[PDB]
Design a protein around this ligand. Sequence first.
Ligand SMILES: Cc1cc(/C=C/C#N)cc(C)c1N1CCC(=O)Nc2cnc(Nc3ccc(C#N)cc3)nc21
Lengths: 401, 543
Amino acid sequence: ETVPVKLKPGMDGPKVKQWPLTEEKIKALVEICTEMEKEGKISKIGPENPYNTPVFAIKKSTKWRKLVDFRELNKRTQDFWEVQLGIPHPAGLKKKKSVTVLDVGDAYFSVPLDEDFRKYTAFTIPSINNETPGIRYQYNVLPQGWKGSPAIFQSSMTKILEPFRKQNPDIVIYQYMDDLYVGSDLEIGQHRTKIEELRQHLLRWGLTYELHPDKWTVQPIVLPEKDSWTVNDIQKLVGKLNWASQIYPGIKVRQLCKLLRGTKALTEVIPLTEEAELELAENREILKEPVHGVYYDPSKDLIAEIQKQGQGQWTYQIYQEPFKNLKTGKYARTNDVKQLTEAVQKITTESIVIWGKTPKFKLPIQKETWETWWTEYWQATWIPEWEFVNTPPLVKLWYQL
Amino acid sequence: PISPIETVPVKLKPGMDGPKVKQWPLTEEKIKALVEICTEMEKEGKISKIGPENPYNTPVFAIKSTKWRKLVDFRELNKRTQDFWEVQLGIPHPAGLKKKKSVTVLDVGDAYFSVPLDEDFRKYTAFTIPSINNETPGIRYQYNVLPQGWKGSPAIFQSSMTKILEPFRKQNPDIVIYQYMDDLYVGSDLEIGQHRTKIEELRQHLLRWGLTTKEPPFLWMGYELHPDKWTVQPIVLPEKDSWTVNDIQKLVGKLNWASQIYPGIKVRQLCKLLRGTKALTEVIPLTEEAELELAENREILKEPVHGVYYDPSKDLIAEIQKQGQGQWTYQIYQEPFKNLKTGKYARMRGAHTNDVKQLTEAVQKITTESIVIWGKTPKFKLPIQKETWETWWTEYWQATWIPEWEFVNTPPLVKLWYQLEKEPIVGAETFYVDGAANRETKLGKAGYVTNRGRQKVVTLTDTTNQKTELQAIYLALQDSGLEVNIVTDSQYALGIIQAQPDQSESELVNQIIEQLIKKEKVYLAWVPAHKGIGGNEQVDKLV
Ligand SMILES: Cc1cc(/C=C/C#N)cc(C)c1N1CCC(=O)Nc2cnc(Nc3ccc(C#N)cc3)nc21
């Protein structure tokens, strides 16, 4: 018996063109998809289905996995999976000392998908050089990647997890899309043992990565420590402080600015006044501590910006209103697109643990570059929304370490 | 025949009913023809007459050469029919095709009328042949097959043919068959004896599904296919004394098309003429550079060039050459220099760019094309030094990644034409520049003051805050020596200039560039305005 799934009122299904794929990935999907067709999880469809969502292969492991971009479908069912049948996000998960992420996507294949909804789950395996027509399919079972899936399965999930919760009431288990986040305060060896028992419970239902969010600390805006000070160094300091003034309430600058009084050569070493040293002091205390007066709003999209810092290091901020930073971080250590792709997954994971939402990413890269290459390193099973931007050049150094 | 294949369920758009357009009355020769035509069709099963219960109607016409065609106007039924999966996602490109030993082409006659229409849907295809001077009831018929002009017919036809062919394909993978519209093109690597044997099984497999059914040069899709090579179908450049806008648009089109296989076709000087709003019929005199490009194009086209086909066992090599003026040209080959395909890149991503940025975005575009056509990226050969590139993309703020590539010395080479200092220059003059513009008068003052005491304020008309802030930097570069430090409060100007632009649409920016190339050291620094940062406030005063 299936749960009827309806789109938002007066919205049509997704008609998203399939990106071009390489030979090795088309072969991977063709094996995967004939196997899913035998098992009955998908079925070929005809030209009467005008809907499409794109599909890719990743490698997470030495086996190709299938990844369906349901971003567009998720936007169009968003009434269903969020207000009518939402999974609540526990505030305690971010506090727990250890958090393990488990894939439970395979659970969704047990469950039949509303027969009148299967048409919106259509996808195409394309053809090299368009020589053959695309192989087209639709799902019959709850598809991985669709936020309707965990919503529909959440009744069966709490039944599966009911014994384990009863016996470990200090363990937090949160479900986001195809993943279970399991957070405990236990010593790491005890923690892993508890995850092992939990795999056993899931394993009795057709259900066959370690975060330490306690150790997630803010990357404060850093003011240089210096012996001498050129006017160039103070100018770069006034610029970095005055912009920080727009975020952290209380940053003061004018005492520094009177050290630069005439039109001085940039290289001349300016002696520091003791009220200046007084103010660099007073400002460092503010910048170390979190922003005052900035709170998460569950009704507003999260934004993440990323700045390339060179030398394999990258900074990022999460916010809903620009300059109201909920979180600021760095990410470190070959390949620019590989590193960015790792950074997006890291920031998205932290964003799921902390808020139950993935951020919309402002990516500093050419769209064509990104879409070409992101699949080669992507290893999560969700996909966040992203825009492409030109990083304001000043912002880059104002978050530099 | 009408193929025994299952039908495709069709439905109208949600909340919509089938058409009821009224039948315009026709001359008596018109309806006589329609009666002739509809009884031939009725006897073959293509249509069937219906009771007057059916409330649906679609107008019908006829027009003539001395025999008559029936034209049904499906505009209203098309507007009410569901959308379909689009029929083709892309055309195969010749350079993606494999060499074939034997090729024959076969055409489905009676294409759409050989395929059944969803019985539950025929009621809406109803049309009416009117009486003479529309006195009595007309003869009402409906389609049982896919009608021509209905928006589902291409989709359901091409889909029907895929279901029909997929047995014969899996029972014969070696053979390739291409479905486009009515056409069946069939290629194989068998000897012309055993090959024509396999074509007959195909025909007999086709007729068992009710589908009844050439020379090396196949003129297809703009191309000339041969079994072992391809090219573009012949390019004739007219020899005109007067060129109209419409003549040059067609020439730009043929050249753009010819550039798929003819290397080094240039069109920029011809495109520059089209800029403007002039009528299709107006004559444009060819500039000197345009007639120079037309010359080089005429010579490139002199002798026929062909393309080879793709050997899946071998790497692809993509070579790029800079042709100046932001025009790039490339060739893809597997054995040098037997080209599978050529092309050109000449876009402008942004207002200001440099050759390194332009070369990277030409690489991305060739890379995407490659994945489309062959399913793998090529190994690149680029006119850029490995260390020029390492220098650029590690200091630059956007992320990038071009795949396996190699330097190839085919001048012009891509260079960075200047480098901004990373630290302020000692013993060099510090200019505190600033520009401003009163935004109603549209007048501006660009100025600078110096740590050595110099000052200057030029005044500009017709400007903006953006343009004056670049003028103030231009000034500081004019009036300074080989080394110089510059302090602006314009993040606009700092962003543009820290990108190491090579070229720009702003000739202002182009002047600043020619300055920065002549210099030996330039440090560029930004301070916030109105924060009272020493020199900043004093050139702010002077402006
Ligand atoms: C067989 C054919 C024909 C046409 C148009 C003909 C006209 N007019 C278009 C395509 C795309 C194919 N297709 C069928 C689809 C497929 O899956 N693979 C193919 C692989 N290789 C080739 N090569 C090839 C070599 C030499 C010649 C010649 N002369 C023609 C073709 N063609 C393929």
